[PDB]
Amino acid sequence: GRILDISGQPFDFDDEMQSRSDELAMVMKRTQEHPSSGVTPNRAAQMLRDAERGDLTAQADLAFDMEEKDTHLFSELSKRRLAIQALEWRIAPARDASAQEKKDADMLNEYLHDAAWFEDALFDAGDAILKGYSMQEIEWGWLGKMRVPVALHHRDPALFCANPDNLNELRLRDASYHGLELQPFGWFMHRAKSRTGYVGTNGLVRTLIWPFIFKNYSVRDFAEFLEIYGLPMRVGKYPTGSTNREKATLMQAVMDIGRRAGGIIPMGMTLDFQSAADGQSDPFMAMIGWAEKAISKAILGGTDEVRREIRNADVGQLARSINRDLIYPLLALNSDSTIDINRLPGIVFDTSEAGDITALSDAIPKLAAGMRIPVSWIQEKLH
Amino acid sequence: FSELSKRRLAIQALEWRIAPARDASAQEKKDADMLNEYLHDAAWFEDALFDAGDAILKGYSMQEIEWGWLGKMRVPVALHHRDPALFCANPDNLNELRLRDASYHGLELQPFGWFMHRAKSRTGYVGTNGLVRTLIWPFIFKNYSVRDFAEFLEIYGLPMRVGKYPTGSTNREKATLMQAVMDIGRRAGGIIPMGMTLDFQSAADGQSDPFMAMIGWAE
Amino acid sequence: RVPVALHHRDPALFCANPDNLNELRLRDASYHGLELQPFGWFMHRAKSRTGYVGTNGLVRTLIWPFIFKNYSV
Amino acid sequence: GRILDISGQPFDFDDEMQSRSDELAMVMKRTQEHPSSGVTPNRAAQMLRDAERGDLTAQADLAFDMEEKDTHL
Amino acid sequence: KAISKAILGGTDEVRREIRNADVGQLARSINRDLIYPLLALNSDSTIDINRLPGIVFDTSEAGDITALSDAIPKLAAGMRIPVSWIQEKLH
């Protein structure tokens, strides 16, 4: 009953979800700050430094606002995140697998391909690309004679503050200096480190906050410029001493100028037209284009080999996280004997580049004569 | 960052193997294969390779080794990437990284407990060979140009709206004039006495060509 | 016993529960709101962006370019 | 007769449509707000935040107006 | 351009990925709420929740008939290619 985790520390496993503990009811329900309203680079630096020190709430809210506000950023982020979901995967057994190990690996493979909550797990784990860390709870359930998850809820990333000590262990916030640690076997954590460093640093929001600010400020300034451009101000200079009644009619006239407007004014009055916005759209669009290009560079790598390498890298990191926290827990809970930590099934994504069928088909039969070429190596390409 | 990640992910893409020593005997080949399989089946090696790429820009990637007992093999169980600022080069011989201990010489590294990867792109000492030495100048130029360009767009294309009230105007007629001159928006149109003026003076004149030229050169 | 017609009710009639923020509940002028009758509500939550039920719509991202384009036009 | 749902909670299934329950007759018939008339970014942010908090009505009406108004969209 | 980027992904692989993703989400929703209800209502025994029919969309990319036709007979000699796999492309 005293199940050991991956690190070999015995503990007692509890079916109750850590959030639903009747003690964190008033700290798991937070109304979002929306800090991206009127951001100044000084304040963005301040929230980034607060996140670096350990308080990740402001950074997570800022990342969420950046995801939903900047349309180009969202398009690029979705383009990157859907690359991962497209890859086909299988639970390849441990190397030199025996009978039972291969059978258990195949059982896990079939169950995961026939579980509706795995695709949600993979889609939500892609949130760590921008915020830095995707944390999902595991609501354990009884499926026949197998203790397997029945739902993976994606908790808000702002609820987790890094420990002030060792700065790499995500701890659920409990209004404490150290913070409440994660309940074992009940928190699917995927830390996607694009940049080496600590848990708060490795998010792409650190790099993308500046182009986001520049692009959005330029866009708003450009829109306000178009609000005024191409329509000159219409000022009338009534002679001094005019009665208080003749100013009202003059103002109602000068505000009545429309299409083909034409009227009469006394010799003492003037109706000069002064421009209220002079310039062109070249600077605003230049800044917008540069910022969008920078955002695309940060997200994908270039505005096709680089995108493939990005996909392979972050897919490998996700696979390592899954092996840590979605295969070993199932094996340990379902089985009763001490699970061999050295040899356990691991998820593998089919990230191999597709093989051009025509070149292989007109090349292999030519090399085959003379060379023993395994059918399998060839069977890997397509079927 | 995009270029640095593009370079660092090239290394991780390469496949590797623990090739035995040349003219390997039986036992040497078997040990080499054992190491190969163990390292391909250890989760902390990929982290080691990803963190060792930090030396590209800073100059030196230092990772501690938390030794652990795996059956009957004393092998690492976790490689923590310590902050590079904690290490100061020895004032003597200037090539041995020593953990800082508030001392002149500094505490040396504990043996068999510090994975050090000194990526020398340029010949020289440990502090020199980082790419930050070369890249600090284009970084400064590009970022200063970018901030200046953004501040220029903050002001460009919206002329300053100054009103010249005749002197001797009551202290109440200056407030209304200022609230009017700050009420100019889309299709704004109003009346001013003959003695007042509403000249529009530009507050930022120029174009985006120089800023973008400098940004392109720096990139 | 199979469906004979699927009526598309107006999405404004549904308010997310103030608790757990992911269960769509038919609005009944109540704080919690009337829950959906089982086996009688075909619900398809298309999450383009990770988050809650109200967040994952594309209107959140597209409201700004829509405003800018239409004001400019 | 006590059919269980996907989540294994027994219940009684009813053929009557939930809307046609003689209690939600005055809340299933709403005349649309059309909030996209004279939208200011402040007000768009306000309705987005209201939708985030749970009241999805304004967001849905805004999305409908965006769908029928912006031709490219 | 921004609206097109948000909707499709680019103003042709990206559109295919978008279609596959949202079609998969729709298929999961249908399996949750348009197959199990029919099975539970029509049948009287306890429906096996673990094993129930699921809707699948034919999202596989079309196969160029000329390349397959002049490649497979060249590989077939020597390798046991299954007619089925080939039958998936078109008929």
Author numbering:
A (entry chain B): 2 to 304, 322 to 401
B (entry chain A): 75 to 293
C (entry chain C): 148 to 220
D (entry chain C): 2 to 74
E (entry chain C): 294 to 304, 322 to 401
What's written in the study?
Myophage Mu is a representative of contractile nanomachines with a simple tail baseplate. It has the capacity to infect a range of intestinal bacteria and has extensive applications in genetic engineering research. Using cryo-EM, we resolved the three-dimensional (3D) structures of the G(+) type phage Mu in both its extended state and urea-induced contracted state, the latter lacking the baseplate, at near-atomic resolutions. The structure of extended Mu can be divided into four distinct regions: the DNA-containing head, the connector complex, the tail, and the baseplate.
Extended Mu was purified from E. coli for cryo-EM data collection, and contracted Mu was obtained by treating extended Mu samples with urea. In contrast to the extended Mu, the DNA and the TMP are ejected, and the external tail sheath contracts toward the connector complex, whereas the inner tail tube is exposed in contracted Mu. However, in both extended and contracted states, the head and the connector complex remain unchanged. The Mu portal is constituted of 12 copies of the protein gp29. The Mu adaptor is constituted by 12 copies of the protein gp36, each of which comprises an α-helix domain and an elongated C-arm.
